Symmetry: D2
């Protein structure tokens, strides 16, 4: 019996631009290893082909779904299809997101809008349509994948990403309080500087910020998300797990 | 010599729907009392009439500007015109904002977009156009007026406001770090539950009002509820040279509310 | 293979005054279920009898030790003897602690001193003697069991406990940064209002109506139930395990949502 | 009318060893400039002489008191004498403190105990004896001078100081909640890496590189934040902190 045995987990941003342990891919793989049926969602189907192979070679259960989760009609259709095919959505992982460079002067206004939409509105829309399902079915768990950029300056200007990710963390807290009585838990993973395929489009420069003598990858995000999504976290809600090698604890 | 003597301060959301100490109005008056020339900005010109009267009764200097600070072309002109008329913009107070009720299910998606735009994009656009002025002139101070809704659930669902105000606090921190070398400081005031015209009008317009007022007061350890004057006094400290080494941080102005969860 | 297979875990405050899921007892049971050999430490054996019974009924491995972990000579001997018996100490759980009522006026100065000693100095001394073992052997994991009283006012005045638990959380962070290069991780669990034998017995043996107090405490928790030591233990298990290899200098709050609200 | 006009402010650690703006010297001077009568307290009486002359050259009101505020009997007498002479204690600034180097292995157990006593028990004892006075008189304001070492690793191991200062910050928050109904406010200043005489005596380049702003503050920065928090302009501010650190704690690059 896996730690998510029999659960249905909807994971956004489950594809990856290249080989390696991206957050979404690692979450899909780890959750399927623990017995969840994974609904793997991405705006590009081909980016999930490698994710599906990893899950299925290990005997896990995963279904790919094409969706633009910035579009509310598409999200509504995705959630309805998930309920139609799987009966329940027990777990939602809001993982879609990506940074764009620049502070308020350099960051173009259109890119600022895209950054808020991709990193924050997506999670809002997924919650809008998944929360009624979780309420009706007796409960559920939501895990937001945020970033240390939402709590610190970590090296680079990226003001839309920083603001959106801070908004994502706080949205998690206030949704947690509002829906706790319906047995819906909401928490965030706050990953730091990880070696993911998106990061690969210097590593010593990022490593110098990390007290631990290595750099994590999507598997580290996935293991924290696994705890928060599981019944072993039944009394954990409205909070975060920072996964950053100690970086945000220091300012030397 | 006042604590802001000779400074030019641009304050958004400086009007109110009615009489009383709104945050923007109180900031405009308090800053003018301390010798700043205030550029008072609002989307409604008449809503600043009372602000102008209070400033001038205090012997202060204020100029009203009609502007929709969600519109970048309008913001760019506002800043260029302020520099042309005043030479400098020493202080920017990002105060425009307003909440709308509802969590992710109840809050209409168009209202979510409006909430992010009004509470967060406005501050981004003001920073976009004021930061080059502050950099060129040798420095400046930015004060964001956020909310305890950005750090806690304080009683009501208002998810766009909560997310936007948390975004505003963090935007302040990252802009502070990026621009510190240019002598630009950025900090937030985090007001809790206050008596301001916009908050009190909404409550009066609507369940059991007596019970709501009591529940709100019960969240505050101090024996009273503050108002815009409290926000203004914290903003004054952060905008002043007495805070020359304070940047990237917040002052919570909430009567002790966020320190408790009993 | 359990999630702590082959690890040696030293857990302080592993006994309880009565039956039920105290934090230390639950940690000992859960860690042993995941394959750790548990060195279960408390002031007296009788409080650990039930802990040992539950560990062993679950097929786990546990050795009881008696120690006053406020006494550095005793701690030094406990660690040296543990290394002699087990070769290593892979995991340290600093769990001993207890609150005493009162703010700065009401709390006696002697009780303030005892509160800092019991809740904070114990963790400092365990780290003093365990860190060299972890450094020499190539790494380790430390989990401090703190309290929401270290981050919020949660209903009751207990200023020594609040200050000590905040100190414990921050000590964890600074030890994490200092020892990260030696592959030692340090994190805290921050439990909220739970059903543990110590908490429940104090409430039951105390001073207005008990049911009124229980309901007042539950009203602070957004979730529709109150957790127990098993919730603390599951968070500690994650933080002690290799699945948290990149997690250090931080906390997991286990409180049903309480500290996220101030309504 | 100064910002503390007519207030009585008891400031611990008001002495200073060496030239420059230490926190205690700067707090005493700034508060007296704003019209407070300052009760300047230190364990070394001579260390306050320059503080007194700076205040008095400006026409301000200050009285020195020799006291070891780790000793509760001495604190009790200090507070009673202050009420007898001044009628009220409106403001308490807990500024005594100092770090000692080392993490849990290196820091001697006796030094750990001294660190908790100096940085945390002192503030507890001052609150124990000042709070009843503030409650009886209708209110008051307490300002704790903590440190960024209570919220971050800032460069050096000093585990007793870090733990004690985190304890001081949280003690302030819980005392704020407990005593708010009595109109007593409690807040902390959280100073970062400052140029103080204490720092200069018992490097500046490494510290400066951690600070986003292009200079390093001193005790005057601590004093200005404490002045705000002690003043009636902060009437609705309680249970919180002002970090005075040039932006350092906002970054981890
Ligand atoms: Mg570095
Ligand atoms: Mg208003
Ligand atoms: Mg117990
Ligand atoms: Mg309540």
């Amino acid at each position: 019996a896996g730690r998510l045995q029999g659960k249905v987990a909807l994971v956004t941003g489950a594809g990856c631009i290249g080989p390696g342990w991206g957050n979404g891919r690692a979450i899909a793989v780890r959750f399927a290893e623990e017995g969840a049926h994974v609904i793997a969602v991405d705006r590009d189907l081909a980016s999930m082909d490698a994710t599906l192979e990893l899950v299925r070679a290990a005997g896990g259960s995963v279904t790919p779904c094409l969706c633009d989760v910035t579009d509310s009609a598409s999200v509504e259709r995705l959630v309805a299809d998930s309920v139609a095919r799987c009966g329940r959505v027990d777990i939602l992982v809001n993982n879609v997101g990506a940074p764009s460079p620049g502070g308020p002067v350099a960051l173009d206004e259109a890119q600022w809008a895209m950054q808020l939409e991709l990193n924050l509105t997506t999670a809002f829309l997924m919650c809008k349509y998944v929360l009624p399902v979780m309420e009706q079915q007796g409960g559920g768990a939501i895990v937001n994948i945020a970033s240390t950029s939402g709590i610190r300056w970590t090296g680079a200007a990226q003001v839309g990403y920083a603001a959106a990710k801070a908004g994502m963390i706080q949205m998690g807290r206030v949704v947690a309080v509002e829906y706790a009585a319906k047995n819906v838990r909401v928490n965030s993973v706050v990953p730091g500087l990880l070696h993911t395929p998106m990061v690969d489009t210097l590593l010593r420069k990022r490593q110098a910020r990390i007290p631990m003598p290595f750099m994590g990858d999507g598997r580290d995000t996935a293991n924290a998300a696994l705890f928060l999504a599981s019944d072993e976290a039944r009394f954990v809600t409205g909070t975060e797990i920072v996964v950053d090698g100690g970086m945000s604890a220091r300012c030397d």
